[PDB]
Amino acid sequence: MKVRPTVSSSRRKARKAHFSAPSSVRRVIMSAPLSKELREKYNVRSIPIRKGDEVQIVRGAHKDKEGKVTSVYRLKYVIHVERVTREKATGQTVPIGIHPSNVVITKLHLDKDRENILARIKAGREQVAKAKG
Amino acid sequence: NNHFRKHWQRRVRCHFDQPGKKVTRRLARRAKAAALAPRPVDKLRPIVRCPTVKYNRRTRLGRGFTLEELKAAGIPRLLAPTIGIAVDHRRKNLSEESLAANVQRLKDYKARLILFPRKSNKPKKADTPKDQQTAETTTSLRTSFGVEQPLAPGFTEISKSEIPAGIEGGAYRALRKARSDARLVGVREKRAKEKAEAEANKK
Amino acid sequence: SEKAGHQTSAESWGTGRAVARIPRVSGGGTHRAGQGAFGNMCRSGRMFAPTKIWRKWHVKINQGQKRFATASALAASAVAPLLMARGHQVSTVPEVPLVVDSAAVAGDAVAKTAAAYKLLKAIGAGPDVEKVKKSKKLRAGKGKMRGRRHRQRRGPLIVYSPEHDGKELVKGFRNIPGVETCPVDALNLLQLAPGGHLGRFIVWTSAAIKQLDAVYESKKGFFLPANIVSQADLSRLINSTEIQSVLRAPKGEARTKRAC
């Protein structure tokens, strides 16, 4: 149960904020869990997804398919994964929309910003665990 | 008797904000107490007797102590509101009982007062020393210095030997005589002038 | 809103031969022109008797009657048939009223939700907690879109003493669904008789059980009420020797033979 007066349990306000969030908030919303070996490697459960990541789909009709994240289409909350596509009537190839909560990240596109993100999340997790221990 | 013949619906006041206003008042009181710590949140008030014959049986808290009360208690009038004593200059002391009660009240407050120095490195003679600066304190002068006995005691036991004889002729007859004398004070004095003038004329 | 259905300019077209005498919106060039207004039967009109904020929302109840009802619900909570009649799973509860030692709850003993849940399972409120856990359902109606999305049953109410047991047990019991907590000096009839039905399952602490008499002695202007009936066992009263030894002979039976 929420206690803070700045927190709202209004379903209307929650849905308005979710469906009218800007791009920087949609990036945080479009997060995916890491794989197991990545979780023991980095001590990080979840990260925002981005282009160039390698994912395994764990939900839906395209389960257990793996590929590279070719697109992060934040406007309808979708990632486009390589080779997880379908054909139109004409036979042309169109990507299939996958929500990021239905995939698991198996390989990270690593740049120094991602290293700083992982390092500060790991440091925060460790200092919370030490404070509560 | 229904006074609804005006445009009454335009000034109907409800009170849905009653618990919210209680919460706001409590928050303001807590902020005032935190700002005024370690002083009490209120000022010391004198004990005064209510006007009119309906309420002159009861005492209550007044606005402030009189200048004569402060002079008799030995507190200067410029020092008094700076140490939590309310001062009223309009009220006077017409009798000794209320004056003595309020002087005793001021003396109790001054005896229980702890006065911190303005500069901690240079304490003064009228300042409370640091080894007596620590004690259990109060923060509500309305509670610690309330009206202890607002009404007179309604029951008292005396021995049968010391029962008073009372007014001769009876209390009812005494009241009737008092009313009759009050009604006839003018006519008797007028006939007193008349008898004096007659005696002076026919002496 | 007090101006709803009245933000239009409209007048009736008078008595004639074609249309009714409802006020009609003046002007032209739009669908609103000529349409009815100001009536409770009209579309886009003011309702009959619009609701006002100065309706009487709150009910003043005598404090003596509140204390009477709280005492009655407390007495009903010590009767185990009423606990089953109110839907509580108390078949494994060792004793009613259930008293737990204050050493198991005082301080930070059950400040963790796992420890509080383990204590409930140990004392036997576990089936009731599980009943509340699996009774969760989606609400039928508009309450879902007005912020009341789910319904579930009521579990145990733990009554404690804040002076002797502390207040971290509140945090320990907070996250368990249906489990409620209450100080012994602020007992709530809305919790003691949920929905007006008597027999709430209460887990007591020893400190609260000890402090209950002082709590009901400290209520100024209220005494524990005297019943109009001294012996509630009607069977014992009727079949006692004192009544039965002076009765008449029975003038018939439960079944009467048909004569003709």
Next chain:
RNA sequence: AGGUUGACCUCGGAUCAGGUAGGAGGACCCGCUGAACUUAAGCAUAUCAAUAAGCGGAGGAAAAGAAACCAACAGGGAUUGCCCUAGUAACGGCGAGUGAAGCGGCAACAGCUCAAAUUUGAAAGCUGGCUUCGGCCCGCGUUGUAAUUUGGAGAGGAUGCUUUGGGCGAGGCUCCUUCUGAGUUCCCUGGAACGGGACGCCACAGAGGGUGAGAGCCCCGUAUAGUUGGAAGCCAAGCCUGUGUAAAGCUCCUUCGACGAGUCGAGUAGUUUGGGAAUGCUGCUCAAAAUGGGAGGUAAAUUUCUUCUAAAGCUAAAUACCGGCCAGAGACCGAUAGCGCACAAGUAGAGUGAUCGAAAGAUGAAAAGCACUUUGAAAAGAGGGUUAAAUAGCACGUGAAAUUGUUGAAAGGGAAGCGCUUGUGACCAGACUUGCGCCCGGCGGAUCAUCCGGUGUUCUCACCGGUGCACUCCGCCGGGCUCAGGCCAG
């Protein structure tokens, strides 16, 4: 030089140096002005109403406010607001009606500044300009700028004691910032598990939302202590130094002790009030006084008494808030509802104009929004795919009724429709299928009776473990008999 040369006063000029005002908003606030419908049978007193409209002026509150008060008591003691006083005192055609205030309880509390005095041993005061920031000028001002005094007093004395200025400051609080627990384990249905079953885990987090169907553990968040980095303020335990040139407080006193004028008040007129004998405001006329003046709710004279001290001014809080900004909620409404507006809504559209003012939400989880073939001028049609579903085809969720088309059945000689009762045709729901008890025969087993021990109970009843050795119990299958079984009938 005096027919000149100046000093002042008043009034002007300047695109002079520097400033300020206007308009918007106006829910709440301070004033001015001011209705009628209504209610009085009608209706010029009245009521609506000291309201709506109109006009002027502020702020986050405004206003009011530190008694020319209330009272009549053993006296209270600035203002505001809530409860109560109280539908009371009081006012009112032909009566409909109207209607306070003192006290008391509480919320909040906070007190002061001028004019009337000679600094007269020194205008000690101040705007502006230039500065090397030391000051120096141009001026304002004696028709009065500083210090001192404001009725609570004060001024002058006497008298002996107390008081004060700066600078650091640990620490704390407010506001943004980094970070936070646990399953996507197995099976089934399903297009998709977020459903069902099993096994776990977290919980100071089982609020809310999203994700292909009801998700604490998939994601964002949620709870709690904190934990990174940054700025600006306020509070603050303490600690260093100057000391009395100056100011300030206390006690007593012979004496002195200035205190607001076309104002107060009176008459009259209008208006207003509960104050239509006791109210306030304004206009005209008259027009004060010095223990004087105001008030003391019935007119006047006389003698007393009680209370304050007008005609100058400032001031937070408790109080209001249909405007604005940020936020949290609801036993409210669920697209004819709820705001006129859930949509490119004060939009489209109408009116010369003031103004008036709508209708209109939903494919699908994902466009996967129909390739290709064929017939058509085309719109489209038919095959054939896409989908879990096209019985979802951008006329799109569900798809009622009025009304219409086809198919099937039927009736109909100037109405149909309805009630009772048959009949015909069409179409249906039940009921029934066998149960129970004996007598034989054949199988499969010993949870038959008694006894012993343990346990529980209703304290005499049961269960459990050994005992049955098959003429005793329990099931199954073949035969026979009795009884009860459905519908219509004699």
Next chain:
RNA sequence: CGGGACCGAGGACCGCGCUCUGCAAGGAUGCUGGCGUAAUGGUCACCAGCGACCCGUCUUGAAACACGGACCAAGGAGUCAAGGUUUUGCGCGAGUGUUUGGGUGUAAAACCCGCACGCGUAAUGAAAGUGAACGUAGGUGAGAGCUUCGGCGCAUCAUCGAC
């Protein structure tokens, strides 16, 4: 002594009786046949015999006149507040009422606190004012209930007294 129609309520015994091994006596049993399904029963459509004005609404005594109704869907009209009065339930009871306010809170909830105040506890008079026991709180006649069977007598009514 025949002939016919319609009906069979109840569900161990008890009773009144008689023509008394039993019975026609406080309500139907016995025997037999066909069929065991659309056969009985039911629904819809239609024909037939008989029956049967179109609804509100208004008017007065009533009709007639008059007025509204092409059809269907969705709205659509004795509500809320304040103050009385009678009755019902509840708490307390010569008292009663926490919620203006304060404390407290898991925070518009619940729980706790008390001064004043409202109503009641005394009335009457324009007012000044005064202010309710002769008596087991009276006598007489009724009066439920109780009684030691002599009476005691609730509520309430009539009547004479008292303050």
Next chain:
RNA sequence: CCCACCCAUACCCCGCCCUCAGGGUAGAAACGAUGCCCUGAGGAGUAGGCGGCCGUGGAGGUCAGUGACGAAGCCUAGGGCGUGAGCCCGGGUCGAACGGCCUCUAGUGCAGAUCUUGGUGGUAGUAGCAAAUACUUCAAUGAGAACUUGAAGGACCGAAGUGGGGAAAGGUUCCAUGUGAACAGCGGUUGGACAUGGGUUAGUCGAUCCUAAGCCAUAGGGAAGUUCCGUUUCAAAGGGGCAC
């Protein structure tokens, strides 16, 4: 005057429903005691009064309630229960929620109001689609030509025009190319329609300047004020020249 016969919801007998009234029912083997058993009488109804039940939106409790193996809704010559309002089930359709019981609560029940909004009929393929004299042939285009074009004929406006140009008003309707639907009360290949583009060149033409009828500032005077009068005034309302 006599005999027989017909039938009313009237009278008699029996069954069943409701109402009312009168009885019974505990040392309870005992009961939705708010129940059951026994007996008798009665049954129309406007205004009006009272009681009980059915239904709808929402709230507390509860049913360890139903549900993608299909909730709600809708259709049904398909059935069951109730005197009834209604309740329940079968079948089809459909796609995400909903119900029973006890209390609480209300914006809670429609045939009418010449209602309100929306939708749809008969009339009915009906009334009309008849002022302004009038059209015809060949070819082309095109799926399609009375109302497109070219040619060929016939006519009309008749110089106060059915001509050539402007003022007001409109605002792109002007020109070229293309065009499915809609509109052009038929038809359309055409269009002032729809789609994309293009087009308006000034020292001399107008505006701009002048003043007319008139209107508005300033000085100043009214008005609580929004503002009214005032336009030459009861205004210090400015131009030029010269200078050893």
Next chain:
RNA sequence: AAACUUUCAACAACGGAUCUCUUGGUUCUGGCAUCGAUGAAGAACGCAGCGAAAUGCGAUAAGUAAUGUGAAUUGCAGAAUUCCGUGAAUCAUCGAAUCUUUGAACGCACAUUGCGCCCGCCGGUAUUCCGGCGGGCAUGCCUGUUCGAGCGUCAU
């Protein structure tokens, strides 16, 4: 017999009721005090590679700077991002800027893109002519400066 009219049923129409939904209303509660001549509110006209509106913005025009985040935007086109970075974005924050014609609206006007005046700078052969650019010119009132008027009062 058919047709026609009417009744019943199935399917298909017409129409948009019902049910479920809800980035919206409505009511209550809490917090805050901040428009404008340093030019407001409002109005008009413009600005995107491809927009009419809504949205955002002002010739620095669906935008600039700065801080933060850290890899998009998306309907098409076209470019990205040294991804180990002075850095995508219709991102967030927001302290620096830009801010057309107007409007209390301010040179005089305005039914005109009309008519002026003062002072600088630049260009065209230019002491004279022509053109462009920049800074200014409302009213009432206050304080001060300076220039004045008047036998109004005086001195000399």
